[PDB]
Amino acid sequence: GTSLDLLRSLPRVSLANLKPSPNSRKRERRPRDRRRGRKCGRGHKGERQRGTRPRLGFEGGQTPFYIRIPKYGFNEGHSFRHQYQPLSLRRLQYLIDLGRVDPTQPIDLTQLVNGRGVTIQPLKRDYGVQLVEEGADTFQAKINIEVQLASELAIAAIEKNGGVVTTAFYDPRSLEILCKPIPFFLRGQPIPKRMLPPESLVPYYTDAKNRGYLADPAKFPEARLELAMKFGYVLPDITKDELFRMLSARKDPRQIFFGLAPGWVVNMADKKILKPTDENLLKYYSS
Amino acid sequence: PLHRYPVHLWQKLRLRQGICARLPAHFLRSLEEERTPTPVHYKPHGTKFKINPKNGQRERVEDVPIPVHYPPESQQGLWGGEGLILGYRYANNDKLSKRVKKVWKPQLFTRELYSEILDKKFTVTVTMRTLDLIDEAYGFDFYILK
């Protein structure tokens, strides 16, 4: 460019020629000159001038504002409430379009996080992803996806195209392994089991209408049909579809990863998977 | 400057140099090991987990032993782990009342005890707890040995 041609003429760049970007630094003012010296910006003698004014929120001796308001449980149990990151079909379509979420294979929270499509924070009480209806009208992809929460309209968009959506619960410990699997294989521990939902969440994940992972499989076809009629689309028979096996693939309710059983150890250095043989240890994991 | 080793490691380093090193290996193990005495003046938590009533969630619990002062007079008798509790109380059992120094003292008795292995009778300063421990041990000799 023309800028580089200017460098050719100009003298060498060196440590003696450096300069910061203009206005990059403000100048700090010492209390030395008459303008900023003398009383030094503090005012005439007094409590605020000696530096001993009362604490923040003190109002000179009347009951402060933040003390005379009734105490109310807006934030009770905030640290215990569950948080589900929202994923919109617009974001899902956009990720697929640019190749960042491969639709050929099943989509699980690992793949979504692995494609920088969602950011999961188990420390801040993230327990998964909830599918968001936004973008349903323009959603034209056939995919198999597992999400901890889903909405009635969000499910309809996935299924109408012939995809599969199932809702699966991951416990706080399992989610952290799911989100960052490799920073776990490096520890050297065996893969833990996946714990069942708490009593409060059991109804949601055992219900077909929500596509629960613990729900009765025989009851799905009725649920799929009713949703199709309500939203005015024809339910597509996915058994005929060539990639039916991939669409129907589902991990065991006590399994975190698709091809890895609980209890195995992943020797990444040697590209091996140590597996136990003991009976009590195999009964513990297979339970 | 700084010391090479933390001050808490100094006693271990002392046992490991000089004539202390030449002491028997088995004897040093008794010196080295620290074991908490069986609880006497506090109720230990039965479990390692409890359900918090206020927020209704499970929270960890730990046992913190009370500091107990053992007067040198106790070393000439058989107190069953008891000692002096030097602490404070709240007057009227409300924390908005004054904090008052309080000392709880063991009830000490003089009793004569017979040892079969020694075939001698000793007169000892003892607490009711110590007598109970001997009864649970099925003999004065069993109490000392166990």
């Binding site: 294989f185 490096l186 520890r187 050297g188 521990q189 065996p190 714990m195 069942l196 009593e199 059991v202 109804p203 055992t206 613990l214 209890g263 150890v265 992943v266 020797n267 990444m268 250095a269 040697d270 091996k272 140590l274 136990p276 003991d278 009590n280 240890l281 513990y284 | 090479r4 080793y5 490691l9 271990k12 380093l13 987990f49 499970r58």
Partner: protein, 87 residues
């Protein structure tokens, strides 16, 4: 001049000397030893079978599991009773 060799990190399994009293305690736990197997695999020298719970350890896990994690059948049964009382 010639610059010294570039800084490099230690390239293989590290097991600290237990006798030394300046070795930090965390490096001597049964959890730091596993970390050596996961990073370096077999060359660590950790006996594979030591990566799994020990008999006494296994019993603790199951007993704790029963106390705090009920089975699916019990959860549904407990839920049903609450609904009947509510009805």
């Amino acid at each position: 001049y010639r610059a010294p060799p570039p800084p490099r990190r230690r390239p293989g399994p590290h097991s600290p000397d237990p006798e030394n009293l300046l070795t930090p305690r965390w490096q001597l736990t049964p959890r730091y030893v596993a970390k050596q197997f996961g990073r370096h695999g077999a060359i660590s020298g950790v006996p594979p079978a030591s990566l799994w719970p020990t008999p006494e350890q296994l019993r603790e896990l199951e007993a704790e599991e029963q106390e705090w994690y009920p089975s699916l059948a019990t959860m549904q049964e407990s839920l049903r009773l609450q609904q009947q009382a509510l009805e």
